[PDB]
Every structure is written in C-alpha cells, then in structure tokens.
Amino acid sequence: MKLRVENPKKAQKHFVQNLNNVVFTNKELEDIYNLSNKEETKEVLKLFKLKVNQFYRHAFGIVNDYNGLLEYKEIFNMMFLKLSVVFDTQRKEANNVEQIKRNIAILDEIMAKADNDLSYFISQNKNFQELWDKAVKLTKEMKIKLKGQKLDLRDGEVAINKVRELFGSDKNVKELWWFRSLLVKGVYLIKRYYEGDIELKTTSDFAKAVFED
Amino acid sequence: GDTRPRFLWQLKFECHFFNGTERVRLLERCIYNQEESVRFDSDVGEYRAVTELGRPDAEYWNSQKDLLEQRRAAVDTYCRHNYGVGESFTVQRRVEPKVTVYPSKTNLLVCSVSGFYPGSIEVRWFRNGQEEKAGVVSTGLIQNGDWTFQTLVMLETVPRSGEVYTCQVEHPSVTSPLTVEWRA
Amino acid sequence: EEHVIIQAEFYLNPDQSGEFMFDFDGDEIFHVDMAKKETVWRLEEFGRFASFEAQGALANIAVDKANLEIMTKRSNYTPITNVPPEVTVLTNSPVELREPNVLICFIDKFTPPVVNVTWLRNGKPVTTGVSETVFLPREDHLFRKFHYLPFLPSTEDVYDCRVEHWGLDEPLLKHWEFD
C-alpha cells in the first residue's frame, strides 16, 4: 500500500482518542481572525485563513479515508489539540505578520506530522493495508459492474444496497462496517466520476487509488 | 485589573542517577496547582494516586499494558539515554573558580569565589599557617542560573600589620588547591 | 544521589501559557519556545553537541493543555493559591568601577509562573542588554527565574529590580548599589 510518508518515523500515543468537541466552530475561528484588525495584517490574514481551511480538510480527509484504522482518532485529535496551542500564540500576536507566517508553517508541520504518524500505523497493520487495498479492488470491479446500472441517489440506502447486492456475501463486507463504508463511498464516486467529474481523482487517497491504473 | 483565578498543571519526568548510571530511578509526576496528584515511581512499577483527585488516572493508566511496559523500561530508553547524550557538557563540565579576597564594612573579611562549575567546592580560611573556624561564615552555594556558581566565605578578623591572611579553595576544576593571600 | 535530569512542562489558564524544558542539577539545558516552536539552548555550545525535535514539545504541551482543562473541572474549578516570590539581587562577581559586571535578579519560591520584571537605574527603566530565563522548576513545585543586567560599576548609579506578582501586596523593588 502506498503511504503518504514512505519511511515513517515511529509514532507516539498520547491516549487522546476518546476526546470530543475538539474541532473549532466557525464562530470560534472568526473570533480569532477578528483580532487581526489592521491593514498591514489583512494580507497575511488571508494566507492564515487558507491554512486553517486546508488544515480542516486535511484532518477530515484522514477520518473519511482511514476511519478503518484504530489510531485514526488519536491522529485527528492530536491535530486539533496542537492547533489549539498555535491559536494561543495567534491570540497574543494577532497583528504580528512574521509570527502569523510562522504559525502557518507550523500548521503544515502539524499536517506533515499527521501524515507521518498515519503512514506509521498503517505500516504496522498489514491486515488493514490488505483490507483497504481489497476495497480499492472491489471498488474497481464496481467501475465496470455499474457501466449502465441505474443509480438513484436521492433515495435512502441505494449505495449499501448496491454493495450488499454485488458483494453482500463477502466475509469482509459482512463483518466490517468500515469495509462497507468504503464500498458505499465508492459507489458515490463511481457515479459522480462517470457523470463528467474527473475532479474525484484527487479528492482523497481512496479516490486516487481507485482512479489510477 | 486582572484578578481572574488561575489554574495550573505541571508534568515532571525526573531521572535520578547514582554513581554514574549504575542506579537509575525515574519519577513521573503530575501536579495540579501546587499539589501532586499522581505518579509513577520506577521503584514501584505502576502509577500511584498521591491524591484522591489522581485515583482515576492511576486506574486508567495502569490498565494500559503497553504503557506500563514503556515506563518500566524508560530508565534505559529515556534516563540513561539522555544522560549519555549530554554527559560531555554537563556531567563532565568544569569551570575554574575565580578567587579574590577583600575587606568589608560592618573587622570583617570576605573570600569570594565565583564563576565555577560544578558546585562542589571547599573554602578554607588561613592565617599564615593556622586555620580560623569560629569567625568563618558562608552565604552558602549560589546558583547563578547560567551554569556557574558563586559563594562568599567571610571571616571575623582582628588583624595586625604584617599578618598574612590567605583564602584557599579546592574544586574539581583544579588538582592543586587555589590560594589568595591578603596583606594587613 | 549524584545527578538529576528533569523534563518539566506546564500549562497555565487563563493566560494560556505553556512551557517545555529540560533541567540538569538545577540548571537549564534548554526549552522550546512557545511561539517560535524551536529549541533554545541555555548555552550556545550545547546545541553543537545535542539536538531536540521541537515538534515533540508541541505534542506534549497540547496534551498538557487538554489535561489542565480536564483537571480544573474534575477539581471543581479549584483555583491556585498565590505564593509570593523571594527576591534577591547580586552581582556575577566582585565589583570594581570601570569593570564590566552583571547584575542578577533571583526570583524564587513563587507560583503561579507569571511575573513582570523591570530593571531600574536611578528610578529609570533600563533595557539595554537585559536578559532573562524561563520559569525553572523546584522540588516543592514552585518556580525560580533569573533576570540579568549587564552594567558598568559606578558610585552614582543605584539599581532596582522591580518585581510584580499576584502573590505580593505591591510591586517589590530590590535595591543595589556600589558599596
């Protein structure tokens, strides 16, 4: 399985996987930005907001694609716990351009460190690696077994039904909710791609693994 | 004025070394405000609540096989490891003491040895041959914060012209005891 | 006992201040800067011989902050009791007019780890060349902090180390002057 970081440096567990309400709301974020109330700041402030957005997409990007890997919450929560610390500085240096740039470089590092720890736990769970790949396999099989198949979105559980239909007997599909969840996600991708939207290719590590070779 | 109450949390990981690294004790402690709530003493092997507030933590952490495992081996992977890492500029650090004597108002004499490291030092007050001990008063070892020490060993005195008061000190930085004479 | 190495970390609310540092027999080996998120060696030399991944401090402090929250609540919002500092001022070595020396301000045995320190020369604030240390640990769980003021010994100059801390009843000024 292709990792986000090829030779992962060992990852640490802080046992923070059960934390909830770690994601900052838009109101909370806006209160932080409103502290940067100066013309000289406005330019970099825009850069800052972009990073936070990228940051959020990166975090959920991991949960959407790897919720099957146990340590996924740990990695996700550690990201937002660290981000909470960066904001302590932001709140004290709201108009310090250089420091705001530094905070931006730190968010990248945080993301990079998450990609690293992710690649590490995946490289410690061959089982998961196989099952993930099998899902990309069974989803590719779906790219064909759906050519002219009728797919009605706006109606209940069409996806899981089409998954239970095409593979409802597979041991993994039967015992692993996370395996099923990847398959269903795939049916939405197969359709959305076939409807003139190659954007899907680079929307996630799953979409990228399925729409290639 | 800012008078909002404060809440503090401190975490300490203490590596205690005896005779090189032959004996190593690791003490991990959690402190809320100024009260230690829970700890892990490598001499014990498991976390122990120091306070009722810390009981939940001792129970939770001791339920983690992989955690107790890492902690029980930290004397090696963490303590001994970090010791070696900086031994050359910490354990083996040595800065020669600057010694210079002079009188003060209050008679009263003061030796004053400064800028030395480590802090283990001996200061002896001599009156050309003998060694006073009743009038000797020390301020004690003083850590300057910059990896150097300083201490002032004073001396009650009733001098006569021609006398030779001398201050001597021995410190790991030098093999032969330093000496500074005083004339009066 | 012969030596003690301490990894000391703290997080303080509502100031949202945190610190990560290593201690050797009471002296600081290094700490990583909150904001800059970089390892700062107490003595420039140390960095020539050792290294630390600052990012590790970030992970730790992050969990430390989460724990302060958990703990504050579990304790029923029991606040910390202020303990005033003990201030002493003295020179780096014996003074001699025309001889460059350093004035050291020792702030000891206090908590929480928040203090304002300003140097005064004849009543006027001096910042030129001043320097300071980060909050150092103590066995009783209180803190220590050093402030330095390079200066030129004189008979006319009269220094003051002005210290502020919630533990005090008013700012504390510690006098010092040649002779």
Binding site: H14, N18 | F13, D57 | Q7, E9, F22, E53, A59, A66
Partner: peptide, 13 residues
C-alpha cells in the same frame, strides 16, 4: 545525539 522525552498522557475520561 538527540534528547528524548516522555510522552504526555491524557488523564482519565
């Protein structure tokens, strides 16, 4: 030569 540190752990619940 790199200094190593102990990981901070999340308190119970």
């Amino acid at each position: 030569p790199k200094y190593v540190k102990q990981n901070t752990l999340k308190l119970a619940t």
